[PDB]
Write an enzyme that holds these catalytic residues in place. Structure first.
Site, mmCIF file in Angstrom:
data_model
loop_
_atom_site.group_PDB
_atom_site.id
_atom_site.type_symbol
_atom_site.label_atom_id
_atom_site.label_comp_id
_atom_site.label_asym_id
_atom_site.label_seq_id
_atom_site.Cartn_x
_atom_site.Cartn_y
_atom_site.Cartn_z
ATOM 1 N N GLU A 773 0.874 -0.779 -0.121
ATOM 2 C CA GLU A 773 0.123 -0.165 0.170
ATOM 3 C C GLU A 773 0.466 0.898 -0.436
ATOM 4 O OE1 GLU A 773 -3.526 0.048 2.644
ATOM 5 O OE2 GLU A 773 -3.700 2.307 2.493
ATOM 6 N N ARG A 851 -8.613 2.854 13.453
ATOM 7 C CA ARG A 851 -9.192 1.614 13.632
ATOM 8 C C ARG A 851 -9.555 0.619 14.833
ATOM 9 N NH1 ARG A 851 -12.176 -0.845 9.391
ATOM 10 N NH2 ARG A 851 -11.434 0.848 7.917
ATOM 11 N N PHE A 885 -5.528 -4.198 9.359
ATOM 12 C CA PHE A 885 -5.100 -2.341 9.704
ATOM 13 C C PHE A 885 -5.287 -2.098 10.702
ATOM 14 C CE2 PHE A 885 -5.638 1.995 8.352
ATOM 15 C CZ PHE A 885 -4.525 2.357 7.592
ATOM 16 N N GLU A 1232 -10.695 -8.136 5.106
ATOM 17 C CA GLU A 1232 -10.136 -7.912 5.513
ATOM 18 C C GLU A 1232 -10.980 -8.851 7.118
ATOM 19 O OE1 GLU A 1232 -9.584 -4.062 4.827
ATOM 20 O OE2 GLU A 1232 -7.374 -4.333 6.524
HETATM 21 O O1 LIG Z 1 -9.374 2.637 7.043
HETATM 22 C C1 LIG Z 1 -8.352 1.634 6.554
HETATM 23 N N1 LIG Z 1 -7.592 2.447 5.714
HETATM 24 C C2 LIG Z 1 -6.589 2.460 4.625
HETATM 25 O O2 LIG Z 1 -5.632 2.891 4.413
HETATM 26 C C3 LIG Z 1 -6.277 0.590 4.125
HETATM 27 N N2 LIG Z 1 -5.837 -0.280 4.452
HETATM 28 C C4 LIG Z 1 -5.897 -2.002 4.924
HETATM 29 O O3 LIG Z 1 -5.496 -2.399 4.361
HETATM 30 N N3 LIG Z 1 -7.771 -1.523 5.390
HETATM 31 C C5 LIG Z 1 -7.268 -0.540 5.095
HETATM 32 N N4 LIG Z 1 -8.721 0.111 6.216
#
Ligand SMILES: O=c1[nH]c(=O)c2[nH]c(=O)[nH]c2[nH]1
Ligand SMILES: Cc1cc2nc3c(=O)[nH]c(=O)nc-3n(C[C@H](O)[C@H](O)[C@H](O)COP(=O)(O)OP(=O)(O)OC[C@H]3O[C@@H](n4cnc5c(N)ncnc54)[C@H](O)[C@@H]3O)c2cc1C
Ligand SMILES: NC(=O)C1=CN([C@@H]2O[C@H](COP(=O)(O)OP(=O)(O)OC[C@H]3O[C@@H](n4cnc5c(N)ncnc54)[C@H](O)[C@@H]3O)[C@@H](O)[C@H]2O)C=CC1
Ligand code: FES
Ligand code: FES
Ligand SMILES: [Ca+2]
Lengths: 1286, 48, 49, 49
Positions: A773, A851, A885, A1232
């Site tokens: 990412e 999160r 996350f 996820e």
């Molecule tokens: O809320 C999130 N933002 C992210 O940037 C991200 N990247 C991820 O793998 N899960 C999430 N969840």
């Protein structure tokens, strides 16, 4: 001679200048361009490089077939063999049945592991056309998959052995006559005598010895000459230990070193016999000989069972393991315990030794003189009254390094239970294989009884003492294992004496003790996958909701799917190698490149000085492209070497000498707390009245929990190719990344050119999981700079060890909790302080903490609640996004204190969880309303389908009837918020073209990493346009077709891109409307051509933004999430209380995926996510030095789930009749949310440990500690008993 | 950051074109270009 | 793109007639931004069909 | 002016790149009665016709 001659897929290869350092993998990919065979680790662990070798065996007089790791096979070892790769067995025009079945059964997701797995299965079938289920599973001991959760691979391949997701009735049959011919030239050459060969490379000379005389002559003249047989040690020493042996001799052709001779005292194997041959010889003997003669053979077999996989055992020699003399050798303790006979020879000399303590005189050393070689080992028959056991306990059962490994032997005086001989030998307890020489003599003439048990145990604990700082660590666990192993041996011997009619002398084994002596037994897998059929009225061309296989599955099974490094090199292409810090915190005082410059092919060394514009990078601009003045972690990128080849880049990178001046380092979470070293302020969510809540509570429980991090282990490591265009600063990059936009932006900023000059292209990734990412850019920016500077294309793919070091992983968490509750189990107050280890840049750390805080409730309504989080700033590689996350960490904490609520209350855990669960319409702690709350449905369905209550009965019965094995069972719910925590990232774009033949080219901002996103978008577009999927194609993702894209992350990509695709399609439909009205039944192609010749545009953009999002931490108001995912998992385990090992017996999952876009992919995602969570909570552990250097850098030491790790009974159901109107065609995100459900295994383990502590604990602590991961170490240490107390 | 799309297609067709050879009607062209050139040469009568 | 730079493409191919030059001039006037902020890299069937 | 502008043949070749040559008629109007590639096949590096 000196020409190297072999065959690849039937074609003759003549290599006139073979370099001994060239592996088969490098030759296949780089010399021959056959890129189906993959690099996944370079160390024998993953099997991605698996190929088949065929040869005429002169000893057996027949054509043989076996699998090898191409990454470790020197091409110089392959004279006169036939290699078969994935390309050699079939292709998309004519798939091999193996390829067809793995593709159609949904056994291929990202596809990077698929060719290696295909080759393992293909090799098995060439040896055994009708294998058993057990043999199939055994084929994959050396193969890893990070995506599938293994279930579909085994289930598809089960069809070879002896609605629905796939139809075995449709699989074409195998016709073995259609396999490739064994090259006739090789059969002709098998009549010519073998001659000595000499290969001379850049640094190494390789001699392939044809006779014993030649070998001995050479070792006499040059004792320095390094013997190589399988190369499974020497290969690792060269690649990873930077060892260079300029002279190598391979004796593999010598008949004397390959002979098997049966004698009166045992079986002698030549030292070069592969372990696979030892296995098959001993298996035959065990089956045909009396039990009393085969005790040692069965001990060897028990060790070989967990010794690597098929690929390593095919080439790894018995002598190779002996002479390597690693202290954790699995065979040496068994050879020592049985006093196996070793023959040693040199020119003129021959001697025979019995392996004992004298054979291993120091670390990795033997009795051998420099000019001597091992000729043979005699493995002995056992005698009457002689019994043998072998033990191994590692971090994972399959393909792993023992923590403690052992061989144990006892001989009784005839007709008695009196000890004549006793030998107890151990690996992993010293700097060598050791015998317990002080303990065993004391037991001679003693009777086999409780007094002998305690005497030996007292002796072992004193004799095999470990310093707290002993290499290998885990010192308490290792000491406990030596005692526990002997205990198992002692009870096993009692049983064997009973079977020899001496039961009245030694006594009966307590029936509740019997399960302690059982050898590991698997039990046949049972799987159920349940999903919903689409409406009867739905068109057969409408694939939305249908189990359509991944669009690339066939190409992935055939190795025709192109990943970044599979792209052919330009003639002028250069290689880059990163140079990284070896210190956690230090000043750079000088850099010396003097030696690097001497390496042939060296171009340049890039540093911060070479950056044209800005050296500030990263999501929060707090990272360097290249280190300036100071390094801030071990792995911190200082510079990059550019050279002509990857080999020369690596060699030159070793010639870059850095001098450091250490600065105070902050490593741990506690270090950061002590130093006030954090990223930004405290994050906080609070609701209700905490003081009131705690005062009203009948009970209050406080505690701490540590949760270890996690390495992504995407099978394809980070890779970038940067192609400079020579005009206007234009550059094109091909990248394994989930984030084209940031890659583009970061490259442009560094170079000082506008975004419009830089194009980033992603066809597909071999996994990402969050790890790509952001962190992919540390490679991309360095490669882009090299390309800019040289004007030539530049490429870098990280080796596994580099990737694991540099790119970071999941955030470790420390939690401090205090929970107030009633005696009914109702929770009334909760206070949790979270701390995470963020490493040396901010990256995504603060969003991850948000999160975690958003999910500290898990599924539970808590009226008075306060959660804080603080992100630690430390001198470690920056941690980043990983599937979940922050959610899994926050939720594990919730479930941890919840488990303690139920125990404190003395109430059934499931009842406590259910009564604390939210109801439809409730608000969360962050004030979002729970609408379309399907969790109670998932719960009730899972409780019923898993038969949780009847199985609770059976678990309790098992635990009362077994002393040294315990079962545990837990049911765990989850709620997971869907949407980026950063509101504006919830947007997606698409671009669609219809060509005048009616075919449609579609692209969107999402990237394919194995999750079947493109497949889903094609399904969406096909329903939208009302045309079959066959007419729609997605080729790639690129910044010059869809700009400003969010990363493929947050499980949200199908939601966001699906809406965009839908809108783009609606725009096209709007334009075709008048032509459809004129020709109502005329085909699609007529409308399209009519629109074109009427000059109507057949191209459109589509765009979507998620409505009404935006949470405020200041006011605790506004919705962070569009909707929530829900799911429930029930898991059962059985632990071995004496070793810490466990079996995952059964898992039942019920998951709300709305109206699934594709149930095959969605079940695959549930299974894949669950198994990654299984790894996180029970297996995967990263280890660092006190100075912050990662020790765990490959699959040898980092243990992800294996084929054998998955729940034996594995049931997944997608919730029926639960449309989610606000997302694309009523679907829900799936990526996820299921991962946390693997906590059901963690708490089942915790349940089993509680039972074990009730059994043997002496007023043991009730609320005992179990940190994550719950590894064999943590499990065993928690099972307090007479052995842990000694 | 307001999640507004920053990508757009554009398209154009020239209106009102279409000549028929059968009826000698309709406009084949959107407009005409016009120009004028004056040139002077000197030839060698003996060589070309 | 988010740095404000513009990537433009169209169906026309450059063969020396200064077509891209003219299109950048056109885009710059239309958008009311300098020509320096607008770039044309290539013509391709997968950007304009 | 600087020779930095990239035309088709200026694009670097891939390591595995092959070359093609067209074979054309030497007759205005004729039947092709046969084609013999025996001599072509002797040329080093020949792949196919
Ligand atoms: O809320 C999130 N933002 C992210 O940037 C991200 N990247 C991820 O793998 N899960 C999430 N969840
Ligand atoms: C993926 C993987 C998993 C593994 N799992 C295990 C495991 O579970 N348990 C375990 O114990 N090991 C394990 N190993 C280690 C390794 O596979 C074994 O030690 C193997 O038997 C080495 O044999 P080889 O022929 O490949 O050795 P090579 O690398 O060819 O040689 C090893 C050493 O032995 C010497 N040598 C070889 N033959 C002779 C001879 N006849 N006379 C004198 N010296 C000789 C060589 O000079 C060299 O120093 C694993 C390795 C890998 C890569
Ligand atoms: N690649 C793989 O997956 C596997 C490889 N093998 C073996 O693992 C080996 C790993 O090599 P290395 O990392 O060099 O490990 P090593 O050969 O140095 O052995 C390390 C182990 O030896 C023991 N040890 C060493 N010194 C000790 C001391 N002073 N006191 C107590 N114990 C001590 C400890 O148990 C320690 O964990 C390989 O060479 C191979 O033979 C075995 C299983 C799996
Ligand atoms: S690349 Fe050879 S085993 Fe992983
Ligand atoms: S599909 Fe096996 S690693 Fe991705
Ligand atoms: Ca970080």
């Amino acid at each position: 001679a000196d020409e190297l001659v072999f065959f690849v897929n039937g074609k003759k290869v003549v290599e006139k200048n073979a370099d001994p350092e060239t592996t088969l993998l490098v030759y296949l990919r780089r010399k021959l361009g056959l890129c189906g065979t993959k690099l996944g680790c370079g160390e024998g662990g993953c099997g991605a490089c698996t190929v088949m070798i065929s040869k005429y065996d002169r000893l057996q007089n027949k054509i043989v077939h076996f699998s090898v790791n191409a990454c470790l096979a020197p091409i110089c070892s392959l004279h006169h063999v036939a290699v078969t790769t994935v390309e050699g067995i079939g292709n998309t025009q004519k798939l091999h049945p193996v390829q067809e079945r793995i593709a159609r059964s949904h056994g291929s997701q990202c596809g990077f592991c698929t060719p290696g797995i295909v080759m393992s299965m293909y090799t098995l079938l060439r040896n055994q056309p009708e294998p058993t289920v057990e043999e199939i599973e055994n084929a994959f001991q050396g193969n890893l998959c990070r995506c599938t959760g293994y279930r579909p691979i085994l289930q598809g391949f089960r069809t070879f052995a002896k609605p629905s997701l796939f139809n075995p009735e449709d699989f074409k049959p195998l016709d073995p006559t259609q396999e490739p011919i064994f090259p006739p030239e090789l059969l002709r050459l098998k009549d010519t005598p073998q001659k000595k060969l000499r290969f001379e490379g850049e640094r190494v000379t390789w001699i392939q010895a044809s006779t014993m005389e030649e070998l001995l002559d050479l070792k006499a003249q040059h004792p320095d000459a390094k013997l190589v047989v399988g190369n499974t040690e020497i290969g690792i020493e060269m690649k990873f230990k930077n060892m260079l042996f300029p002279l190598i001799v391979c004796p593999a052709w010598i008949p004397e070193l390959n002979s098997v001779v049966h004698g009166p005292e045992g079986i002698s194997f030549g030292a070069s016999c592969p372990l696979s041959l030892v296995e098959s010889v001993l298996a035959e003997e065990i089956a045909k000989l009396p039990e009393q003669k085969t005790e040692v053979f069965r001990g060897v077999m028990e060790q070989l069972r967990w010794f690597a996989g098929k690929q390593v055992k095919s080439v790894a020699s018995i002598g190779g393991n002996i002479i390597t003399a690693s202290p954790i050798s699995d065979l040496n303790p068994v050879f020592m315990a049985s006093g196996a006979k070793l023959t040693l020879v040199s020119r003129g000399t021959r001697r025979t030794v019995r392996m004992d303590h004298t054979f291993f005189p120091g670390y990795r050393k033997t009795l051998l003189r420099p000019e001597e070689i091992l000729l043979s080992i005699e493995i002995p028959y056992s005698k009457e009254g002689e019994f043998f056991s072998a033990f191994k306990q590692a971090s994972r059962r399959e393909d792993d390094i023992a923590k403690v490994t052992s061989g144990m032997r006892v001989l009784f005086k005839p007709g008695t239970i009196e000890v004549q001989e006793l030998s107890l030998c151990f690996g992993g307890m010293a700097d060598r294989t050791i015998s317990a020489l002080k303990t065993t003599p004391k037991q001679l003439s003693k009777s086999w009884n409780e007094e002998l048990l305690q005497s030996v145990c007292a002796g072992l604990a004193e004799e095999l003492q470990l310093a707290p700082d002993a290499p290998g660590g885990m010192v308490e666990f290792r000491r406990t294992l030596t005692l526990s192993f002997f205990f198992k041996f002692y009870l096993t011997v009692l049983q064997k004496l009973g079977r020899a009619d001496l039961e009245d002398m030694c006594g009966k084994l307590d029936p509740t003790f019997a399960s302690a002596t059982l050898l590991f037994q698997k039990d046949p897998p049972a799987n159920v996958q349940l999903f919903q059929e689409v409406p009867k009225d739905q068109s057969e061309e409408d694939m939305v909701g249908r189990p359509l296989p991944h669009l690339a599955a066939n190409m992935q099974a055939s190795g025709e799917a192109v990943y970044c490094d599979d792209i052919p090199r330009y003639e002028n292409e250069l290689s880059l190698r990163l140079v990284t810090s070896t210190r956690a915190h230090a000043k750079i005082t000088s850099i010396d490149t003097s030696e690097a410059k001497k390496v042939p092919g060296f171009v340049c060394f890039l540093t911060a000085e070479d950056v044209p514009n800005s050296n500030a990078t990263g999501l929060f601009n707090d990272e360097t492209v290249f280190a300036k003045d100071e390094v801030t972690c071990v792995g911190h990128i200082i510079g990059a070497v550019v050279a002509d080849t990857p080999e020369h880049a690596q060699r030159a990178a070793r010639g870059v000498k850095i001098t450091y001046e250490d600065l105070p380092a902050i490593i741990t979470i506690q270090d950061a707390i002590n130093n006030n070293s954090f990223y930004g302020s405290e994050i906080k969510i609070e609701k209700g009245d905490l003081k009131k809540g705690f005062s009203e509570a009948d009970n209050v429980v406080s505690g701490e929990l540590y949760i270890g991090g996690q390495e992504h282990f995407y099978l394809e490591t980070n890779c970038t190719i940067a192609v400079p265009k020579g005009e206007a600063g234009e550059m094109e990059l091909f990248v394994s990344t989930q984030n084209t936009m940031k890659t583009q932006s970061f490259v442009a900023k560094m170079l000082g050119v506008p975004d419009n000059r830089i194009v980033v292209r992603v066809k597909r990734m071999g996994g990402g999981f969050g790890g790509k990412e952001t962190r992919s850019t540390v490679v991309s920016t360095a490669l882009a700079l090299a390309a800019h500077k040289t004007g030539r294309p530049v490429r870098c793919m990280l080796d596994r060890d580099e990737d694991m070091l540099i790119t970071g992983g999941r955030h470790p968490f420390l939690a401090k909790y205090k929970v107030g509750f009633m005696k009914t189990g109702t929770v009334v107050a909760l206070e949790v302080a979270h701390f995470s280890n963020g490493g040396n840049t901010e990256d995504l750390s603060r969003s991850i903490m948000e999160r975690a805080l958003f999910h500290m409730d898990n599924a539970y309504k808590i009226p008075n609640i306060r959660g804080t989080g603080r992100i630690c700033k430390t001198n470690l590689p920056s941690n980043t996004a990983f599937r979940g996350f922050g959610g899994p960490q926050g939720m594990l904490i919730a479930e941890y204190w919840m488990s303690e609520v139920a125990i404190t209350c003395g109430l059934p855990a499931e009842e406590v969880r259910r009564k604390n669960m939210y109801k439809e319409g409730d608000l969360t702690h962050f004030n979002q309303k729970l609408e379309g709350f399907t969790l109670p449905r998932c719960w009730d369905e899972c409780i019923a389908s898993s038969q949780y209550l009847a199985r609770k009965r059976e678990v309790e019965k098992f635990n009362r009837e077994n002393c040294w094995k315990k079962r545990g069972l837990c049911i765990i719910p989850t709620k997971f918020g869907i949407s980026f925590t950063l509101p504006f990232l919830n947007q997606g774009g698409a671009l669609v073209h219809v060509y005048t033949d009616g075919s449609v080219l579609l692209t969107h901002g999402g990237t394919e990493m194995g999750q079947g996103l493109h497949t889903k978008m094609v399904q969406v577009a096909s329903r939208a346009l009302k045309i079959p999927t066959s007419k729609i194609h997605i080729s790639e993702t690129s910044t010059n077709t869809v700009p400003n894209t969010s990363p493929t992350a947050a499980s949200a990509s199908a939601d966001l891109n699906g809406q965009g695709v839908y809108e783009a399609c609606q725009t096209i439909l709007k334009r075709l409307e008048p032509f459809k009205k004129k020709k109502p039944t005329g085909p699609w192609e007529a409308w399209v051509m009519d629109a074109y010749t009427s000059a109507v545009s057949l191209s459109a953009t589509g765009f979507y933004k998620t409505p009404n999002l935006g949470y405020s931490f200041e006011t605790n108001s506004g919705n962070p999430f569009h909707y929530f995912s829900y799911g429930v998992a029930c898991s059962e385990v059985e632990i071995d209380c004496l070793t810490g090992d466990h079996k995952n017996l059964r898992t039942d999952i019920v998951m709300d995926v709305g109206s699934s876009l594709n149930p095959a992919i969605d079940i695959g995602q549930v299974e894949g996510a669950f198994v990654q969570g299984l790894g996180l909570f029970t297996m995967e552990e990263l280890h660092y030095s006190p100075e912050g250097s990662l020790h765990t850098r490959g699959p040898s030491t980092y243990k992800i789930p294996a084929f054998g790790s998955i729940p034996i009974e594995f049931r997944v159901s997608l919730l029926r009749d639960c449309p989610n109107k606000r997302a694309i065609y009523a679907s829900k995100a799936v990526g996820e949310p299921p991962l946390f459900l693997a906590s059901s295994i963690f708490f089942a383990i915790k349940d089993a440990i509680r039972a074990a502590r009730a059994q043997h604990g002496d007023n043991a602590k009730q609320l005992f500690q179990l940190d994550s991961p719950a590894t064999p170490e943590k499990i065993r240490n928690a099972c307090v008993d007479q052995f842990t107390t000694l």
